[model samples]
Target: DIQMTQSPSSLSASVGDRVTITCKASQNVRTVVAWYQQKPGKAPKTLIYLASNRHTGVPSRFSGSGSGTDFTLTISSLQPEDFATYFCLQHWSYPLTFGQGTKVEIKRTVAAPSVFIFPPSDEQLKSGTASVVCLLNNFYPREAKVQWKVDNALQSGNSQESVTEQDSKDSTYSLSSTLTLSKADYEKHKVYACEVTHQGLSSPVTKSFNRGE
Candidate 1:
């Protein structure tokens, strides 16, 4: 795993400020890239995949429009709630890779950062059960870790977990974690998180999730 690092490990920005983070592959990775956003107690959210495609359901303000070794994750109009941490991952080869991550804060860094949770579909919510899924898109090296946390605490039992590594123009590594909780859990705004630690980065980066307002 090639380690990925971000310049300006920390940045200060107000709402609507344009921010960018650069991710490099240790070697040639072709064009497999992914980006994510993480707040303190919230799970990481996928912003860009395959180097540029915005994940479905993401806000239009968040856009990734880059390719090749040099790519960028851009937030056109940062929202107040968008203040948090961000990371990048490469999917151009096996073993995969991730950027060290850049923490976005307000005037000063705060403690117990709020979690960002993605609500389940209406059908799923109505079913009385919901599953939180983490998508590790466009990774190389094929080996990665994804886990779930609840209410700021890690959960022990989760079902339907798997990893899928496919060979593309470049190798791509990916995995997902499915967390099954009753509708009550979602209603209570329980926290859930996902962490992707790959051999390519300096330290393991985590994304936390909690009920949204």
Candidate 2:
């Protein structure tokens, strides 16, 4: 599966201010996109779609740009009524995807999670399984997404996400997920990838591992 992420967990702005929110997809999401806005205590409403087109009845000041992996939502001039949260949604795939909203109400608040594979140790590479783990740390807010890619395609491997934990004395939370697979997969010289998404990263971070450790 492809990965995705949003930037700037929060921001501060005012009326007449120009604000922009960003979303980055691990791979191109093409033009199939959606940008949503949610005011306090209400459901989110779509403001933009197909990357840059405004939804019907939305204000003209609300515009969108970017394509493939990089997209932006910009409010030409902030209106007091616009003091709300904005986020990007890539509905092109199953389960829909990305974002916890970028706070655009004129304020401030935020890892690029690290991805790696634990290869079969010692003499096990030619006979045992390998595990891919994604470590998401140094991030504020508590949300993340993970996907295991097998040779460029989504893999249906046995995978698990660990509960988020406080990893630093500074109080930031860190989380991890591991994808388990058979030694046969490694013997085949297969390529495995750990794709991680976080509120602190603009683009999905992906790492690849393969044969011979």
Candidate 3:
């Protein structure tokens, strides 16, 4: 399967703002590019096909350009309703490939999430198990991935996560993840980590919890 990579994994834009998303295919897709839009709780709707042709009913403000391995989807002027997710696909060959969707957010300012790791409470530590909490705050676009690692090894299957809408109304969201492990594992691991990946961030943010000597 061909791999498709999209840039600016996510963007924050206001109504009337011009925005462009680029997609690069691992190999030439020629003019076989297609673009699609999807809103929350709905299926994807095609916007452009064959690289530049607008699907019927899609606004002229939304257009596509480029061919081969490089292509772009441009919104001449963002509309309030255009703030959603977009993706590009290559159907030139079997096992079609799609770019990781780009998100068009309503807010104009893009901000990276603040990551904090809270050590297990003393009471929890006393029970021979500990729960480490990770707080990811103030990130826009509402989509971020979290991973937990202990002593350089990936840990999973004993974690829980939740999302909390903010009361501050800055168009940002907050997330928390709790990783549960035995007290022995907690004290044994030289380091614990919370790794976060968000579209607004240029690189993944990793917050480490280290035990003192």
Candidate 4:
């Protein structure tokens, strides 16, 4: 209702993993807020409030940010005991609404980057611009970086790398980003690159593709 619902619905996470879930309302709410976490076979408790703290108890790796609707509950370097279902509450008014809590399950930790690239169809190849996607897998949310390049030259082509939450429930997450480029540019360099960055990665994981072959 007027209370809360979260993005991701549910996810698998691990220690040192950073994941953020959004809380939204049917109407605009900007005053005060709170978040609760309920473990499997348990009830939800205050994990955050007034945007950042539960006040009664909390974790050092937990943090908060402002999302479009109102608030975001983000956890960094996740912990094993953090397994639970999370919900947001709009304490700013009556009824004190909340949503079907988003569930979190603890899992084995790994941040592997899986990158993919696609070529424009002959029809699209004539359209001038095409979209290429870089898909990253099994990684934490924060410290994620994507860089684009053509013929080895770095360029800031239009790209999107949105934070993603996992519902697989095995304890890992994935991300996707798109790079828009001129189809004609494809003919010139033939080398398109999407480089990703994350912690413990001494060097960025890079992947590339060329014109249809």
Candidate 5:
């Protein structure tokens, strides 16, 4: 399958702003290009197909142009409803491929998040329940995957995560997650870790805490 790459992988724009996202296929894909929009946690909606035709019900502000190995998706006027991810797909051959997504955000920046972890407080540990926290701060485009590990293995159970937008026109977002385990279990396992997966990172960020440390 041919690979498709997108440029300006993400951008910050305000409502009524105009932006263009570009996609390039590794090989010629002719005019069988398609563009789609995806909001977080939802299925993608087709915006353009066959290179330049707008999909049914799509707004005229959303347009696509180009053929061969190059294609572009343009938003003439960004609206409140248009802040989401967009990607290009090439269907000129079997085993179609899609470009990396471009996130259109309305915030101040498109940046990587910083990760931090806190061990259970002495008070919480004394209560028989251990709560560990992982915090991700100052980032854009708002997509991240978090995981917990115990004794070098994946830890699975109930974990809570929340997101918030920081100060106005400043860094984009802040996220946090918490994991709770019995103090007895934490004493036995000895090592607790938090890892984060985000688009701006070349590798997952991780932090760990050792019992009694």
Candidate 6:
């Protein structure tokens, strides 16, 4: 099992912004991939996999088309109710892998802003450091949080850090959180995670990270 790490943990977008998620396989998974949309407190809905096959009962707006070790999941138009968490999953092996996640929200500047989620690479895990970064960009109302968990238990609050700034487009906000861990902790497949919450967003957007290095 290869470890999976997602980046730009969250993103902001308007009603029609295009969203993209890039999932990278640890080695070469051949061609098995899956994408899912997760809402607060609800099960995730599969959107794409194996490079362009749409799952049953999914909206056409949610489409995924990619190949080989890298793939992309795109949401053409963002809907009002589409403000939620999106992720990519690779089922090429046991202990499925997923991109951290990108949360899409209505941006203040545009009618819709596209969100991008990028997964970490194997070289990153090869580094000796034990730190994880979660980003929340282009959100509104300026009241959301991100955190990390280990083995289903919340670590010390000191392990979590957050930052907020104005979006380049103006009239919008972005936030990010970083979790630092000792090398020993991350080596255990501790199930690191990030959680984001806001009003009218249903439930907190949560993502779990498992290292397969």
Error of 5 at 111 (Å): 17
State the lDDT of candidate 3 residue by residue for 134-173, as single tens digits: 9988787677888998887878788899886432335567
Q: Global CA lDDT of candidate 4, please?
A: 0.71
Off by over 4 Å in 5: 108-127, 132-174, 177-213
Off by over 4 Å in 4: 1-108
RMSD of each: 16.3, 15.0, 8.6, 10.4, 8.5, 17.3
Question: Over the stretch 1-213, how does candidate 2's per-residue lDDT look in tens digits?
Answer: 656677878876655788888888878888777899987667988899898998999999999988888888989887656766788888778767866678765322453445555544645555576666666655655567778777777766477877643332333456667777767765565677778777677888887776444
lDDT of 1 by residue, 37-143 (tens): 98766799888887778898888877775555666777786665676678888867667777888876442122121112245677788899987877666554445
**Residue 89 error for model 1, in Å?**
0.6
Model 4: per-residue lDDT, tens digit, 1-213?
475767879886666688888877657767466788776555667777777664565776777666436678888777766777888878666778886677876667455666666655677767777777788776644457888887787776477776554433544567777877676666777787888887747789888877644
lDDT at residue 12 of model 3 (Cα atoms) = 77
Lowest-lDDT window of 10 residues in candidate 5?
164-173
Candidate lDDT values, in order:
0.66, 0.71, 0.85, 0.71, 0.85, 0.64
Model 5, 31-114: lDDT tens digits are 899999997777999999998999999999999999888999999987766777899999888788888899887754458888
Better of 3 and 4 by lDDT: 3
Candidate 2 wrongly placed segments (more than 4 Å): 107-213
In model 6, what is the error at residue 132, expressed in angstroms? Answer: 36
lDDT of 1 at 67: 54
Clashing pairs in 5: none
TM-score of each: 0.48, 0.49, 0.54, 0.51, 0.59, 0.50
lDDT (C-alpha) at residue 166 in model 1: 35
lDDT of 6 at 61: 86
lDDT of 1 at 54: 86
- Worst ten-residue run, lDDT, model 6? 110-119
